[model samples]
Target: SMWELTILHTNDVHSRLEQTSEDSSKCVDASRCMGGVARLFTKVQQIRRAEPNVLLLDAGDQYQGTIWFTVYKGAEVAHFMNALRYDAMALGNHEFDNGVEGLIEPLLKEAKFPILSANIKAKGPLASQISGLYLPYKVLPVGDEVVGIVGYTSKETPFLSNPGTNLVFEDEITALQPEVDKLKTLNVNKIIALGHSGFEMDKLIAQKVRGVDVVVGGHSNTFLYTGNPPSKEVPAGKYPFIVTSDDGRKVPVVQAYAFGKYLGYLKIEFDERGNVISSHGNPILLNSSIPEDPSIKADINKWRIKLDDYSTQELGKTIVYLDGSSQSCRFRECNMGNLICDAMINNNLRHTDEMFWNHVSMCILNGGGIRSPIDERNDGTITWENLAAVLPFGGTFDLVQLKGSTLKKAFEHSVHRYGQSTGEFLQVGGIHVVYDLSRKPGDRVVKLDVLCTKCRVPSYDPLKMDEVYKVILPNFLANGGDGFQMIKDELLRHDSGDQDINVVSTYISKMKVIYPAVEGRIKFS
Candidate 1:
């Protein structure tokens, strides 16, 4: 007999509990909003009422993004997740943004569902917090058979986010195989490898790992769909991307985009031999037509009262749209990237002493930090809330002094994974670079030049290898976040104690109206 199972899933919600602002391309009216806990609650409830065998799953990254997370921390996440009642959730790297003490402990105490991770090995202080809270794999009884769900988080979490020192992350494939083997011994053949690794790694897992029928993934916020593309989102790949195993079996992989924008719905049929016979379905768009659960909306409104003041203030106007979408910023020289780097450079010029203003030459911001695009509103105006959502971490600025040689090394590290759209790619100001991706990774840069710090006409000058120059960047990268270890030990570093969001807002407020375009600051040949 073949067993049919419906998997209702979400990943990378990132604490967007409220509906998204009106983007005319997406919604017809300002009142017509898309995505919220309320809408998700209604949809999930409707599915459960109509379906016989269903599993609600989240592939992790339920933490961080908007003011909801920045304010309530994990308490709100635990409350809403418990209210929805998830079956299982993988550990996302952002859950450790405030360290284990703030988030992991509260979540462990509050979450009613099984929070899982097969690869995270908690030691010392973190051990006690996660002792009974996390599971390697969860076996659920559906119909006459059992389905084993194995969870794994990205091993790159340490390099990408703040997982802390007490916890150790192991290889995803290595950690998962043992858990899948253990499940197989118990006669559980219907297995799922649910993880928070990126889309590429998810397909890799499906191909390499044995006994996994499906892989649900997160972290990169991939959009998988069939047929026509949704209004604003372009499909990253086919829905339920099929991967062939070494044993000649097929495995399906799926993921929804972030910010509660869509719900992933996949139906899979398994044969009596435990092989997946077939799979289908696309990410369900959460649009205005869907009704929001009144009770959940009320709960969200209670939290909204706390953030109304800061979120409602108008920041500035943009003549040209700023593109901060993950697809644009992570891969190429985007307008939003240029705007941010310019703001950081301007911040130093405005605040630094006159004598020291000539010392600062360049500014760099990480592409990963630019979250969402500046959507076109009816008025083309941006608010503080929009800015906050763009750079949610509110990381402070740091001015560092380094040799031109060290700066070149940093640029080389930035484009290490050029075509792959890695977050380490730098968005720069006051410098121009030409790199060749066809060449080896470490030897990619062909030309490098910097704007003279004292130049009134913004003339370019070849960088002096031994000469020292000051640059502005986020404290996150300055302290060696996102694998930027080249300039961690700066010759002279000073913390401005100023938020990047505020700096951008200030720059915009001064300009009143700004048009930022992508020039030849960063080029690839």
Candidate 2:
């Protein structure tokens, strides 16, 4: 007998409850909105009613990127997930953003669905919430047979997020096999590895793990599709990026792009022995045409009232477009990066005495910190929500004095993960550096230039290893958040105690109509 199942999935939603602005160029009046919780509910409900065997799953990262997560924490996330009736979810790295006490406790209390992560050991106070709130695997009664769904999350959570010492993460491959074995013991032949370990890791799991029939993934916000394009978004790969396991079985993987922009719809047909005979799917674009569910839209509007002051309040204007897209910011010198770094430097200069202004030579912000792109408006309008979305961490700005030699070391560290899309990539303010990826990591910097301190005109001079220069950046980085230990220990640091988002907001407010350009602040070969 042949059994068929449909899986609807989303990942890295980042609490985008409202439809995104139709115009990527600006967030203003548009006839329709795209990709909100309402639309997702509407789509999922339609499919469930039509298909008898359907599972609604979210891969992970229902946290951060918006005011909803900020104001209500995981409570809002839990509320929405419950309302949507998600069958299961994996713990995204950002779920640990508020630490275990903030997330683990409340998510356990509120979520009706099981949160799964097989590779993590919940020690200390978090141990109780593990079995009660989360699971290593869950069995779903679909059609005539049982389907086992095992979970795993990013092991790099501790390094990338603040899970604290309470929860220790382990490698996904080794940890997952035991869970799959346990399911096999229960005579479960069809097993799905639901994980937030990104596209590559998902493929790796499919290849390494013996029994995983499918891998639903998140964490990189990857878009996998098949056939002709759906709407405007380009797919990273074919949906169900099939991989041959070590045992020579084919395992399919899928991930939808983030922010509720697309919902992955996968249909799988399994044989009597529970091997997937055929599988096909595509990411359904949550475009403006899809109608938002009335009830969910009403609930979102109620929440919108609480956010109107923050989300709608005007902050400043931009004369030109600022590119903070992950593709641009993570790899190269982006305009938004330039603007933010300039704001940090100007904030330092504004607070300091004019005589001491020359003391500060550079400002740096991480590409990872600039979370979202600033859509350019013809009116050049912006809101507090817009700014907050970009710099959600709201870390305190810190000024650190480092020797020129140490500064170069920090630059070397920035490009160490070259072409890897690592967040450690630096965005600059007051200095220009040319780097070559062809060179070795430590020697990547070919030319480093600093502004001439004593010159009347804006002049450039070679960096002096002995010269002490004041640099401003977020406290997260100054204290070695993203592997900048060299600057943290060797440098003289001062806490400005200023919020980074506010610094950018204030700078934009002062400039009124600012035109921030990427004018060779960073050059790469």
Candidate 3:
């Protein structure tokens, strides 16, 4: 009846080591900047000073997003996290972007805190290599109470990133339940599921698995708040979205939005029986008013100089903003999306063989691959290094021929999560698609039109279900990333070794003064 604890968490912090602007563009004013490791550091230390029993945890995705991770990899992540004094962390899908070696390369050795993942199993040679790196859970004494923190990564990591063939990710509930059962035997009454399985999966884990008092989630970059829209990002749900377990326990699932913009604060009270009696808190927005820790800010500067060593070359001038924000790209046809796909279509036309040159004029790219926005600076310039942050995965493309029937299926999957921000949404260059989001997923594609490359006068033509067409798309989708295995299964494919950012770089350089716009390529009703 006397136990109370505070949990501070962050997730999907895709390497915004410096403060981010509201739109993730160049911040001209330091007073208007939002999140950064420095601001987050101040918030955490402030909360620790006020609260008696505290656990600082993160729900993975501490890697990738910028040139920082592209250059430093996990070394910077390890450095900052240790300074923040995180208790435990779950693995995000992006952690395996560089495969097993990069993950362990000094990261497992450098991180002072525990890296936990109950779901990731080393299946082959690297089994021993990673065996000592990740822990199933971390048990710590907080004041007079013993708290158990269990971890689980997204099982979809294999489809989303490069975890290599040596790793196997098990189902979340399967891996988590056993850990809780083991903790209970040790008389640890309090248990928290620190997971990177996204918001929906977090709720499912809370409902199906017993004895989980809290679920701190990541992966979906879900924003859950209590008051009026916090600075443009609408809340997915309430601050602490509560779920009742199979055994009748109230479990709270919480997540702060990505990019270190907000720090999640959840305070829970438990009765003598080790059941949650109450929980209260909200994610604190790390706006300009919050002062940055001098130490962290200075450290970030050191890295920024190092980042400057790999200087960016100015590629082109932009008259308009290039928006690759999740709100724009994932939900609608964004200009940045248009720019990338346009680059792909044009690049493919020149690179493809003469056999298919006349027939191939279309490109489709997943919106999730497009990260960050490019704002026109005083010089009105967009640099190659800045754009590299947009397509940071270092992915390539594929030239493929697909039947109209398969194209319809691929488009259906794109709008499956219609109103929500999902990574699989497609951005097109030479096709027009109308989606009735009110309709069911499979039936959402109301009408489809394809650009006629073969016609003497190029124009939009209604898609023929049986007709085959050539399209350029990221190898990620052609190989089944974002669940487009249908494209993987049905394709007359030609591999294009051209790098993603480089193609766009070449396109912008040729255009010189670039401003790509969305012209109803994808419409939603």
Candidate 4:
């Protein structure tokens, strides 16, 4: 007897329940708001109707992104996924964005589906919520075939997720190998691995590891069908498995685009032994072609209205437009960088002065956190939307000090940027350096610029070595943190002035009508 198994998948939805358009240059052909959960539900329901033996899955980062996850902390998204009947979801790094406390029971309580993360061990408040559902693998019996499903997450989640959770991620191969053996002993014929570890790790698994028949992957936010597509080749070794390729060959592999823009499908055929079969994989656009399920659509609209209401609550406005594009990843430094650093300096200085305090030195902000750019507007009316585009995280401000030499080391690691974690993405405030890529690593910050909020330029040069100038930076940098080498030194460090102040309040108060510009302060060679 032949029974058909259908697999529906999504990855990096990033809590976007609404469709996106390819209107932005970031997305080429897919330049529209192509991902709405409401539309996705309609497509899934329509496909499931044709094949009753179907499984719905998400690769991870389901919550967190946009204002939806920020407001609800994933409760609303969990309920919606439950309503749509998701079989299981993997543990993406962003899943722990709210910390493990919000993710486990409180978040999962509303959802009926299982969250598959073999490596993530939930303790504390998240422990009770994620029990049973966080299994390493589960076997499903369809007709005469028993299929095993396994899950894995990334090891770097600790760095990406909010720190202090102390949660641990097990090695994928180490954690999965034994489990697969156990399942194979149970006569599970087709083994599918649900991974939020990323495409590179998935490639390693598909090429080097064994026991995984098909891998539904996430994290790298990969477009499986894009140029240099992911491969589904089974190594010429024992326990060779099929990838369930996106093209529908009974091979093994499939993924969807991020931000809920695409709905993925993998169709497979198996023989009596349930071992070998061909599969086809492709994605359906969550575009206007698909009708929006009213129920989900209603919720999405409700959230949209809620966001609109919250944003327009009359917080404040801007005089110029800010760009929130991550495109700065391509440039050494950008206008967005100047704006953020300026905000940090302006806010920290104002707070310190009001408090009648001193010892405040410099401000530092992460370029990655900067997120968007500031685009000038013709109307000259900067609204809350413009501010949102600049400081999306609403990150708090910190005031701490460090010794001169230690500060130099921290500056060098960042400005002499290379690889993914350059000072370009480093957090900044209260300090400036002339970064020249042409120079050697330790000496790239050619022109060491420093100063107090009162001084027009830096009071001391970081490279002077003997200069024991006071340093002011965010708390994230004060505690020997975030890859800055000099932060942990036992120096004369204290909060700049207002320990409780953050960038948002100070941004509006100081620059309610602010203009920021980078005037060749730190030029490159």
In the order shown, the candidates' Cα RMSDs to the true structure are 2.6, 2.2, 1.9, 6.2
Q: For model 3, what is the alpha-carbon lDDT of residue 25?
A: 58
| Model 1, residue 188: C-alpha shift (Å) | 2.3
229-340, model 2: which lDDT tens digit per residue?
Answer: 7666667888878888899888888999888888889999989888999999888888767898999989988877877788566777887877877778888999999988
TM-score between candidate 2 and the true structure:
0.94
How far residue 322's Cα lies from its native spot in candidate 1, in Å, is 2.1
Better of 2 and 3 by TM-score: 3
lDDT of 3 by residue, 63-143 (tens): 888878987888999988898898888888989888878788747778887888998888767887677788888888899
Clashing pairs in 1: none
Q: Which residues of candidate 1, in runs, are more than 4 Å off?
A: 21-32, 354-359, 454-458, 489-497
Q: Candidate 4 overall Cα lDDT vs. reference?
A: 0.62
lDDT per residue (tens digit) for residues 1-525 in model 4: 555678889898866656643321111133333557788899999998888678888888886655566567788778778878888888787777776667765555666776777877767865665567567787766555567888889887776666246556778878887887888788786777888987667766655446666778878655555223223211221111243333333436666756676777877666665544566656665766677788888877776776665444433444554444444532355555556566556655564435533435455655555433433433344444434434444434555545667666766776555643332345444456667787888887777677644456646444456565554454555544456646666556555333322455456555556555545545567
Compare candidates 1 and 3 on lDDT and give the better one. 3
Which one wins on TM-score? 3
lDDT of 4 at 326: 46
User: In terms of TM-score, how similar is model 1 to the real structure?
Assistant: 0.92
Q: What's the candidate order when arranged by decreasing lDDT? A: 3, 2, 1, 4
- Looking at candidate 1, the ten consecutive residues that score lowest on lDDT are 21-30
